[PDB]
Amino acid sequence: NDTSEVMLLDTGWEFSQSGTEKWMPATVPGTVHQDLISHELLPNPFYGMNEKKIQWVENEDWEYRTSFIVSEEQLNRDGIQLIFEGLDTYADVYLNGSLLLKADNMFVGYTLPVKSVLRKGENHLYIYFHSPIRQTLPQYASNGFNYPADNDHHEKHLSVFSRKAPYSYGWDWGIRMVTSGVWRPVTLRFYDIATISDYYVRQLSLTDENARLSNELIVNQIVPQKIPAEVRVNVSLNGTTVTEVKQQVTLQPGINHITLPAEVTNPVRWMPNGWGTPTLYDFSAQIACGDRIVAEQSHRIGLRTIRVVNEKDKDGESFYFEVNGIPMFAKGANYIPQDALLPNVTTERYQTLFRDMKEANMNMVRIWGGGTYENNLFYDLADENGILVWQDFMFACTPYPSDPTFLKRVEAEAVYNIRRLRNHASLAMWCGNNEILEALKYWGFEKKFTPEVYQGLMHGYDKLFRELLPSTVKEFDSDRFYVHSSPYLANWGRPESWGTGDSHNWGVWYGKKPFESLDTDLPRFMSEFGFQSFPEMKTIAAFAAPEDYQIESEVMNAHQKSSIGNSLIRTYMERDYIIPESFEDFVYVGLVLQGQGMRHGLEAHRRNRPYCMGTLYWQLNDSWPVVSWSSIDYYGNWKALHYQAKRAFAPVLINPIQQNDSLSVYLISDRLDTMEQMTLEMKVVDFDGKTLGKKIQVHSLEVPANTSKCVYRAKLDGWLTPEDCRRSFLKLILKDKSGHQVAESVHFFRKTKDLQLPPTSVSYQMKQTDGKCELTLFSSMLAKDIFIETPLQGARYSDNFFDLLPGERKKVIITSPRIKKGELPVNIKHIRETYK
Ligand SMILES: NCCCC/N=C1\N[C@H](CO)[C@@H](O)[C@H](O)[C@@H]1O
Ligand SMILES: [Br-]
Ligand SMILES: [Br-]
Ligand SMILES: [Br-]
Ligand SMILES: [Br-]
Ligand SMILES: [Br-]
Ligand SMILES: [Br-]
Ligand SMILES: [Cl-]
Ligand SMILES: [Cl-]
Ligand SMILES: [Cl-]
Ligand SMILES: [Cl-]
């Protein structure tokens, strides 16, 4: 919003495999792999078994070029700046015969002064990407040991040497595609006098009465004269000015530091999803020289406090978030990259993923450390959806080097991304890495390395995670929490450690523990736990053949990367369900299983507030069509788990929990207000619809804000017979004084495999128009865990993976832009259908 002119360098690019002298059109931002695919120079890397057939790319070097025109009038501007938001990774940048940059960190943006190198007329930009494998082979050869990075799918674990997305080398839900390229935008800015290098809105204090801010600017003045200027900051809300402040300065050549206080009286606070509005102010900083605004930069700013409380207490050491002074139970998931090829993730895909977290009642996301520091749009969407962000630095599972050069590269990326992200309302904390200290302690090592190399790794840990990173946070983001590792102390095999900080409870899945264990094995905060599923059939059809459907088949094992995969799924399924004979039915029941088991954990964590203060499941999403722990597949289809997470995260939840042949019912609220004069009503209904016994009523209930409380206990014995338990379910509703329903739940008394489910038809009527299909479903008898299956990729449902209750009609709306007036194919599956 100033006199500068920005040229986007996003057209006219060509690329070439080094040594071929053969050039073709490219798409920038982009990746080498996509550029090849677009010219049918590579097969669909996600299809079938194309993974092995695409690996060759990682051994070549790749060159990119573009030309552009500069006019005499542009060449005459005071300054001209070329900005690379992202280069993956070892890139030699040449412009007009000048080596401008030898890039070496995927996570750093580079700002380059180029006016003295540009020419009137045609200009030639030329980028040389060294193979990150061949670049680091000599480095590895000199190292004399292989770092234990099991997720790096190569004999030589080269990932640890490069500041490049860890997942790109492979992971336990991911394809190996060690790509290269101009992965974020390239801009040329022509400007006068100065640019704003950094604008930081630093909150000094916040009360209901006043927010005090400090506007900290860094201005890079490019001309040799002293330049009188006036710095102005405008604070607005919804287009209307709230306050305005200004400061006279004379800008000196080079860097200038400018600080302007501003205050907002009676500030409208940013609140997280579920507690109100994610209000964002617009803060705009301008540099005005005479009549002209030579430089402007704005941020959207949310006014709130976030405190992470991590303190010794009677239970061990707490780990929770206090938002605007109120302890906030965290509800969310771990986020991984949305694609093997990052530039392929569109604005639309980011918007939809946030819609998916918001609609599932989430208030937090963990950006896990084997991915990337996300793009600005991700954090912008987190801001406007009221989702808190836990940001790992990009270190995961393995110890890393700690030599001076390496720590210099890391320092660059830490400074860059902290300054990049620190104005976001959503940003809640930093975490040095995923599971490295656990790895060092327990994985085990010290049987794997000499004592000397082991000691070096231990000192190397401290240098990076207990010194460099926490110092950098203290300097550049001094009011945000940092912890050196997640989990920082708790280990899932060591019950004595569970009351200390956050847990990754991998007892379920890796430890083979039943889902019931989640009721007893409680953390102070669950930062990971999870369970895998095959994605639904239309997703399998994007990647496998009917031949290719047994699963531990070649491909159906090729698409599983956990240490066991599809073995474990069957093992757990047998505990609770009849294992279906057909592959398609097995896929359906596996979705149901992951949903039901995980939901039982999310409920245990909320039920056990305040001992437990959060649950973030592993994992939200997928990077490609694969078998994984995700609740949303690569094509955006919600698995059962996503619907179940939405239910389990509902602001008010009725939670029936049955153990030791007894039922308790808890009422769980994350509301900010207390509910008074409430009635819990329950009744036992058989699978034919017939009420058994009488309604049970619990009157005069209070549901206080932000609490979980037991309101009802009954022994099963004397109430229902073992036969009644396999033949009926419990219906529960909660209502206010007048009889308006605020919540409902259903409860089963036995495992699904033990239920005497009746054969039944789910019939439906359909009303189909452009973009929309409204179905009304009916079954005279219980239909268990119904799946409404359509072939349309990414179709959205008002509900799915729910029990259709006997004789009770249920409306479901299906939407997709592909739905054309004039029949959407619909296949309704339910549990009884899967066996005979
Ligand atoms: N020793 C095996 C236990 C690893 C637990 N951690 C994770 N599990 C996920 C699924 O396996 C994995 O993708 C992530 O790195 C995560 O931190
Ligand atoms: Br310049
Ligand atoms: Br510059
Ligand atoms: Br200064
Ligand atoms: Br919330
Ligand atoms: Br620390
Ligand atoms: Br029981
Ligand atoms: Cl502590
Ligand atoms: Cl060794
Ligand atoms: Cl239960
Ligand atoms: Cl069950």
JSON list of C-alpha atoms in Angstrom, two decimals, residues 205-363:
[
{"chain": "A", "resi": 205, "resn": "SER", "atom": "CA", "xyz": [-0.05, -5.52, 28.43]},
{"chain": "A", "resi": 206, "resn": "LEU", "atom": "CA", "xyz": [-3.69, -6.48, 28.08]},
{"chain": "A", "resi": 207, "resn": "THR", "atom": "CA", "xyz": [-6.63, -5.89, 30.40]},
{"chain": "A", "resi": 208, "resn": "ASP", "atom": "CA", "xyz": [-10.35, -5.48, 29.74]},
{"chain": "A", "resi": 209, "resn": "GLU", "atom": "CA", "xyz": [-9.67, -1.71, 29.91]},
{"chain": "A", "resi": 210, "resn": "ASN", "atom": "CA", "xyz": [-6.59, -1.27, 27.79]},
{"chain": "A", "resi": 211, "resn": "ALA", "atom": "CA", "xyz": [-4.19, -2.99, 25.41]},
{"chain": "A", "resi": 212, "resn": "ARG", "atom": "CA", "xyz": [-0.73, -1.49, 25.26]},
{"chain": "A", "resi": 213, "resn": "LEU", "atom": "CA", "xyz": [1.32, -2.25, 22.15]},
{"chain": "A", "resi": 214, "resn": "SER", "atom": "CA", "xyz": [4.78, -1.45, 20.90]},
{"chain": "A", "resi": 215, "resn": "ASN", "atom": "CA", "xyz": [5.11, -1.12, 17.11]},
{"chain": "A", "resi": 216, "resn": "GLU", "atom": "CA", "xyz": [8.65, -2.15, 16.31]},
{"chain": "A", "resi": 217, "resn": "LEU", "atom": "CA", "xyz": [9.85, -1.44, 12.81]},
{"chain": "A", "resi": 218, "resn": "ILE", "atom": "CA", "xyz": [13.08, -2.31, 11.06]},
{"chain": "A", "resi": 219, "resn": "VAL", "atom": "CA", "xyz": [13.56, -0.02, 7.98]},
{"chain": "A", "resi": 220, "resn": "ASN", "atom": "CA", "xyz": [16.31, -0.60, 5.42]},
{"chain": "A", "resi": 221, "resn": "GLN", "atom": "CA", "xyz": [17.14, 2.76, 3.77]},
{"chain": "A", "resi": 222, "resn": "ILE", "atom": "CA", "xyz": [18.87, 2.27, 0.36]},
{"chain": "A", "resi": 223, "resn": "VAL", "atom": "CA", "xyz": [19.93, 5.84, -0.59]},
{"chain": "A", "resi": 224, "resn": "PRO", "atom": "CA", "xyz": [23.07, 7.65, 0.65]},
{"chain": "A", "resi": 225, "resn": "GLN", "atom": "CA", "xyz": [21.38, 10.82, 1.99]},
{"chain": "A", "resi": 226, "resn": "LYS", "atom": "CA", "xyz": [19.70, 11.38, 5.35]},
{"chain": "A", "resi": 227, "resn": "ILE", "atom": "CA", "xyz": [15.92, 11.36, 4.71]},
{"chain": "A", "resi": 228, "resn": "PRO", "atom": "CA", "xyz": [13.37, 13.04, 6.96]},
{"chain": "A", "resi": 229, "resn": "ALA", "atom": "CA", "xyz": [10.32, 10.81, 7.28]},
{"chain": "A", "resi": 230, "resn": "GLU", "atom": "CA", "xyz": [7.24, 10.45, 9.36]},
{"chain": "A", "resi": 231, "resn": "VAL", "atom": "CA", "xyz": [6.35, 6.93, 10.66]},
{"chain": "A", "resi": 232, "resn": "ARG", "atom": "CA", "xyz": [2.64, 6.37, 11.01]},
{"chain": "A", "resi": 233, "resn": "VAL", "atom": "CA", "xyz": [0.73, 3.45, 12.54]},
{"chain": "A", "resi": 234, "resn": "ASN", "atom": "CA", "xyz": [-3.00, 3.13, 11.99]},
{"chain": "A", "resi": 235, "resn": "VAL", "atom": "CA", "xyz": [-5.05, 0.68, 14.01]},
{"chain": "A", "resi": 236, "resn": "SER", "atom": "CA", "xyz": [-8.42, -0.15, 12.52]},
{"chain": "A", "resi": 237, "resn": "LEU", "atom": "CA", "xyz": [-11.28, -2.57, 13.00]},
{"chain": "A", "resi": 238, "resn": "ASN", "atom": "CA", "xyz": [-13.58, -3.52, 10.13]},
{"chain": "A", "resi": 239, "resn": "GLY", "atom": "CA", "xyz": [-12.34, -0.45, 8.14]},
{"chain": "A", "resi": 240, "resn": "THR", "atom": "CA", "xyz": [-12.80, 2.11, 10.88]},
{"chain": "A", "resi": 241, "resn": "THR", "atom": "CA", "xyz": [-9.83, 3.73, 12.63]},
{"chain": "A", "resi": 242, "resn": "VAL", "atom": "CA", "xyz": [-9.47, 2.95, 16.35]},
{"chain": "A", "resi": 243, "resn": "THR", "atom": "CA", "xyz": [-6.20, 4.77, 16.96]},
{"chain": "A", "resi": 244, "resn": "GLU", "atom": "CA", "xyz": [-3.43, 6.45, 15.04]},
{"chain": "A", "resi": 245, "resn": "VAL", "atom": "CA", "xyz": [0.12, 7.40, 16.17]},
{"chain": "A", "resi": 246, "resn": "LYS", "atom": "CA", "xyz": [3.09, 8.99, 14.40]},
{"chain": "A", "resi": 247, "resn": "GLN", "atom": "CA", "xyz": [6.76, 9.76, 14.85]},
{"chain": "A", "resi": 248, "resn": "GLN", "atom": "CA", "xyz": [9.21, 12.10, 13.14]},
{"chain": "A", "resi": 249, "resn": "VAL", "atom": "CA", "xyz": [12.57, 10.58, 12.22]},
{"chain": "A", "resi": 250, "resn": "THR", "atom": "CA", "xyz": [15.43, 11.13, 9.89]},
{"chain": "A", "resi": 251, "resn": "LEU", "atom": "CA", "xyz": [16.28, 7.86, 8.24]},
{"chain": "A", "resi": 252, "resn": "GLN", "atom": "CA", "xyz": [19.96, 7.03, 8.01]},
{"chain": "A", "resi": 253, "resn": "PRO", "atom": "CA", "xyz": [21.54, 4.91, 5.25]},
{"chain": "A", "resi": 254, "resn": "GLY", "atom": "CA", "xyz": [21.23, 1.22, 6.15]},
{"chain": "A", "resi": 255, "resn": "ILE", "atom": "CA", "xyz": [19.11, -0.27, 9.00]},
{"chain": "A", "resi": 256, "resn": "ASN", "atom": "CA", "xyz": [16.92, 1.94, 11.17]},
{"chain": "A", "resi": 257, "resn": "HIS", "atom": "CA", "xyz": [15.07, 0.77, 14.29]},
{"chain": "A", "resi": 258, "resn": "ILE", "atom": "CA", "xyz": [11.84, 2.59, 15.01]},
{"chain": "A", "resi": 259, "resn": "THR", "atom": "CA", "xyz": [9.53, 2.03, 18.00]},
{"chain": "A", "resi": 260, "resn": "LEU", "atom": "CA", "xyz": [5.98, 3.56, 18.28]},
{"chain": "A", "resi": 261, "resn": "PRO", "atom": "CA", "xyz": [3.74, 2.92, 21.23]},
{"chain": "A", "resi": 262, "resn": "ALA", "atom": "CA", "xyz": [0.00, 2.62, 20.62]},
{"chain": "A", "resi": 263, "resn": "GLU", "atom": "CA", "xyz": [-2.92, 1.81, 22.88]},
{"chain": "A", "resi": 264, "resn": "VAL", "atom": "CA", "xyz": [-6.38, 0.34, 22.28]},
{"chain": "A", "resi": 265, "resn": "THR", "atom": "CA", "xyz": [-8.87, 1.20, 25.03]},
{"chain": "A", "resi": 266, "resn": "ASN", "atom": "CA", "xyz": [-11.62, -1.34, 25.86]},
{"chain": "A", "resi": 267, "resn": "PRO", "atom": "CA", "xyz": [-9.97, -3.86, 23.44]},
{"chain": "A", "resi": 268, "resn": "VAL", "atom": "CA", "xyz": [-12.19, -6.48, 21.71]},
{"chain": "A", "resi": 269, "resn": "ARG", "atom": "CA", "xyz": [-10.34, -9.75, 22.52]},
{"chain": "A", "resi": 270, "resn": "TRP", "atom": "CA", "xyz": [-9.40, -12.57, 20.13]},
{"chain": "A", "resi": 271, "resn": "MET", "atom": "CA", "xyz": [-11.06, -15.72, 21.40]},
{"chain": "A", "resi": 272, "resn": "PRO", "atom": "CA", "xyz": [-10.42, -19.35, 20.36]},
{"chain": "A", "resi": 273, "resn": "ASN", "atom": "CA", "xyz": [-12.95, -21.52, 18.50]},
{"chain": "A", "resi": 274, "resn": "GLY", "atom": "CA", "xyz": [-15.85, -22.32, 20.85]},
{"chain": "A", "resi": 275, "resn": "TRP", "atom": "CA", "xyz": [-15.38, -19.32, 23.23]},
{"chain": "A", "resi": 276, "resn": "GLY", "atom": "CA", "xyz": [-16.36, -16.47, 20.94]},
{"chain": "A", "resi": 277, "resn": "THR", "atom": "CA", "xyz": [-15.16, -14.36, 18.06]},
{"chain": "A", "resi": 278, "resn": "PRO", "atom": "CA", "xyz": [-11.56, -14.53, 16.66]},
{"chain": "A", "resi": 279, "resn": "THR", "atom": "CA", "xyz": [-11.51, -10.71, 16.39]},
{"chain": "A", "resi": 280, "resn": "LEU", "atom": "CA", "xyz": [-8.64, -9.33, 14.32]},
{"chain": "A", "resi": 281, "resn": "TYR", "atom": "CA", "xyz": [-7.50, -5.68, 14.20]},
{"chain": "A", "resi": 282, "resn": "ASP", "atom": "CA", "xyz": [-5.68, -4.27, 11.20]},
{"chain": "A", "resi": 283, "resn": "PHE", "atom": "CA", "xyz": [-2.32, -2.63, 12.09]},
{"chain": "A", "resi": 284, "resn": "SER", "atom": "CA", "xyz": [-0.76, -0.67, 9.21]},
{"chain": "A", "resi": 285, "resn": "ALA", "atom": "CA", "xyz": [2.69, 0.95, 9.39]},
{"chain": "A", "resi": 286, "resn": "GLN", "atom": "CA", "xyz": [3.66, 3.50, 6.75]},
{"chain": "A", "resi": 287, "resn": "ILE", "atom": "CA", "xyz": [6.85, 5.44, 6.06]},
{"chain": "A", "resi": 288, "resn": "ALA", "atom": "CA", "xyz": [5.92, 8.84, 4.56]},
{"chain": "A", "resi": 289, "resn": "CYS", "atom": "CA", "xyz": [8.61, 10.97, 2.90]},
{"chain": "A", "resi": 290, "resn": "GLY", "atom": "CA", "xyz": [7.13, 14.33, 1.98]},
{"chain": "A", "resi": 291, "resn": "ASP", "atom": "CA", "xyz": [3.94, 13.62, 0.12]},
{"chain": "A", "resi": 292, "resn": "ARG", "atom": "CA", "xyz": [4.63, 9.92, -0.69]},
{"chain": "A", "resi": 293, "resn": "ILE", "atom": "CA", "xyz": [4.16, 6.65, 1.25]},
{"chain": "A", "resi": 294, "resn": "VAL", "atom": "CA", "xyz": [7.38, 5.00, 0.24]},
{"chain": "A", "resi": 295, "resn": "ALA", "atom": "CA", "xyz": [6.85, 1.80, 2.30]},
{"chain": "A", "resi": 296, "resn": "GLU", "atom": "CA", "xyz": [3.85, 0.17, 4.02]},
{"chain": "A", "resi": 297, "resn": "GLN", "atom": "CA", "xyz": [3.32, -3.13, 5.86]},
{"chain": "A", "resi": 298, "resn": "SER", "atom": "CA", "xyz": [0.23, -4.42, 7.71]},
{"chain": "A", "resi": 299, "resn": "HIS", "atom": "CA", "xyz": [-0.65, -7.33, 9.98]},
{"chain": "A", "resi": 300, "resn": "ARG", "atom": "CA", "xyz": [-3.90, -8.57, 11.31]},
{"chain": "A", "resi": 301, "resn": "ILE", "atom": "CA", "xyz": [-3.49, -8.65, 15.10]},
{"chain": "A", "resi": 302, "resn": "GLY", "atom": "CA", "xyz": [-5.49, -10.51, 17.72]},
{"chain": "A", "resi": 303, "resn": "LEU", "atom": "CA", "xyz": [-5.56, -9.06, 21.23]},
{"chain": "A", "resi": 304, "resn": "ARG", "atom": "CA", "xyz": [-5.33, -11.89, 23.70]},
{"chain": "A", "resi": 305, "resn": "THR", "atom": "CA", "xyz": [-3.16, -13.51, 26.31]},
{"chain": "A", "resi": 306, "resn": "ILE", "atom": "CA", "xyz": [-1.81, -17.05, 25.93]},
{"chain": "A", "resi": 307, "resn": "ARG", "atom": "CA", "xyz": [0.05, -18.53, 28.86]},
{"chain": "A", "resi": 308, "resn": "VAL", "atom": "CA", "xyz": [1.35, -22.08, 28.91]},
{"chain": "A", "resi": 309, "resn": "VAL", "atom": "CA", "xyz": [1.29, -23.29, 32.50]},
{"chain": "A", "resi": 310, "resn": "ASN", "atom": "CA", "xyz": [3.97, -25.90, 33.08]},
{"chain": "A", "resi": 311, "resn": "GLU", "atom": "CA", "xyz": [4.48, -26.09, 36.84]},
{"chain": "A", "resi": 312, "resn": "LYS", "atom": "CA", "xyz": [5.17, -28.65, 39.56]},
{"chain": "A", "resi": 313, "resn": "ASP", "atom": "CA", "xyz": [2.03, -29.73, 41.36]},
{"chain": "A", "resi": 314, "resn": "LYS", "atom": "CA", "xyz": [0.63, -32.56, 43.47]},
{"chain": "A", "resi": 315, "resn": "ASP", "atom": "CA", "xyz": [0.13, -34.68, 40.35]},
{"chain": "A", "resi": 316, "resn": "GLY", "atom": "CA", "xyz": [3.63, -34.17, 38.87]},
{"chain": "A", "resi": 317, "resn": "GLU", "atom": "CA", "xyz": [3.97, -31.25, 36.40]},
{"chain": "A", "resi": 318, "resn": "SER", "atom": "CA", "xyz": [1.00, -29.57, 34.70]},
{"chain": "A", "resi": 319, "resn": "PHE", "atom": "CA", "xyz": [0.89, -28.75, 31.00]},
{"chain": "A", "resi": 320, "resn": "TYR", "atom": "CA", "xyz": [-2.01, -26.56, 29.88]},
{"chain": "A", "resi": 321, "resn": "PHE", "atom": "CA", "xyz": [-3.00, -23.39, 28.06]},
{"chain": "A", "resi": 322, "resn": "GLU", "atom": "CA", "xyz": [-4.59, -20.38, 29.69]},
{"chain": "A", "resi": 323, "resn": "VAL", "atom": "CA", "xyz": [-6.27, -18.15, 27.15]},
{"chain": "A", "resi": 324, "resn": "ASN", "atom": "CA", "xyz": [-7.46, -14.66, 28.21]},
{"chain": "A", "resi": 325, "resn": "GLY", "atom": "CA", "xyz": [-6.93, -15.83, 31.75]},
{"chain": "A", "resi": 326, "resn": "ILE", "atom": "CA", "xyz": [-9.12, -18.93, 31.55]},
{"chain": "A", "resi": 327, "resn": "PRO", "atom": "CA", "xyz": [-7.77, -22.51, 31.49]},
{"chain": "A", "resi": 328, "resn": "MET", "atom": "CA", "xyz": [-8.66, -23.87, 28.07]},
{"chain": "A", "resi": 329, "resn": "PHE", "atom": "CA", "xyz": [-8.94, -27.60, 27.46]},
{"chain": "A", "resi": 330, "resn": "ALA", "atom": "CA", "xyz": [-7.11, -28.20, 24.10]},
{"chain": "A", "resi": 331, "resn": "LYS", "atom": "CA", "xyz": [-9.06, -30.15, 21.46]},
{"chain": "A", "resi": 332, "resn": "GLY", "atom": "CA", "xyz": [-7.40, -30.88, 18.13]},
{"chain": "A", "resi": 333, "resn": "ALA", "atom": "CA", "xyz": [-4.93, -32.84, 16.06]},
{"chain": "A", "resi": 334, "resn": "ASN", "atom": "CA", "xyz": [-1.34, -33.11, 14.70]},
{"chain": "A", "resi": 335, "resn": "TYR", "atom": "CA", "xyz": [-0.95, -31.60, 11.24]},
{"chain": "A", "resi": 336, "resn": "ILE", "atom": "CA", "xyz": [1.44, -32.95, 8.57]},
{"chain": "A", "resi": 337, "resn": "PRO", "atom": "CA", "xyz": [2.15, -31.54, 5.08]},
{"chain": "A", "resi": 338, "resn": "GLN", "atom": "CA", "xyz": [-0.91, -31.73, 2.78]},
{"chain": "A", "resi": 339, "resn": "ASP", "atom": "CA", "xyz": [1.12, -33.01, -0.20]},
{"chain": "A", "resi": 340, "resn": "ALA", "atom": "CA", "xyz": [4.33, -34.76, -1.21]},
{"chain": "A", "resi": 341, "resn": "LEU", "atom": "CA", "xyz": [4.74, -31.67, -3.44]},
{"chain": "A", "resi": 342, "resn": "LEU", "atom": "CA", "xyz": [4.16, -28.56, -1.35]},
{"chain": "A", "resi": 343, "resn": "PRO", "atom": "CA", "xyz": [3.45, -25.96, -4.11]},
{"chain": "A", "resi": 344, "resn": "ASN", "atom": "CA", "xyz": [0.56, -28.20, -5.28]},
{"chain": "A", "resi": 345, "resn": "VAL", "atom": "CA", "xyz": [-1.44, -27.22, -2.14]},
{"chain": "A", "resi": 346, "resn": "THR", "atom": "CA", "xyz": [-3.82, -24.54, -3.26]},
{"chain": "A", "resi": 347, "resn": "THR", "atom": "CA", "xyz": [-5.50, -21.74, -1.34]},
{"chain": "A", "resi": 348, "resn": "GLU", "atom": "CA", "xyz": [-8.68, -23.80, -1.62]},
{"chain": "A", "resi": 349, "resn": "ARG", "atom": "CA", "xyz": [-7.14, -26.89, 0.00]},
{"chain": "A", "resi": 350, "resn": "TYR", "atom": "CA", "xyz": [-5.84, -24.80, 2.92]},
{"chain": "A", "resi": 351, "resn": "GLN", "atom": "CA", "xyz": [-9.29, -23.15, 3.35]},
{"chain": "A", "resi": 352, "resn": "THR", "atom": "CA", "xyz": [-11.06, -26.53, 3.33]},
{"chain": "A", "resi": 353, "resn": "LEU", "atom": "CA", "xyz": [-8.66, -28.06, 5.88]},
{"chain": "A", "resi": 354, "resn": "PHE", "atom": "CA", "xyz": [-9.46, -25.21, 8.27]},
{"chain": "A", "resi": 355, "resn": "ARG", "atom": "CA", "xyz": [-13.16, -25.60, 7.69]},
{"chain": "A", "resi": 356, "resn": "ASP", "atom": "CA", "xyz": [-12.62, -29.29, 8.66]},
{"chain": "A", "resi": 357, "resn": "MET", "atom": "CA", "xyz": [-10.94, -28.37, 12.00]},
{"chain": "A", "resi": 358, "resn": "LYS", "atom": "CA", "xyz": [-13.46, -25.67, 12.81]},
{"chain": "A", "resi": 359, "resn": "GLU", "atom": "CA", "xyz": [-16.45, -27.92, 12.00]},
{"chain": "A", "resi": 360, "resn": "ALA", "atom": "CA", "xyz": [-14.95, -30.64, 14.24]},
{"chain": "A", "resi": 361, "resn": "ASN", "atom": "CA", "xyz": [-14.99, -28.21, 17.22]},
{"chain": "A", "resi": 362, "resn": "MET", "atom": "CA", "xyz": [-11.20, -28.01, 17.36]},
{"chain": "A", "resi": 363, "resn": "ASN", "atom": "CA", "xyz": [-9.33, -25.19, 19.07]}
]
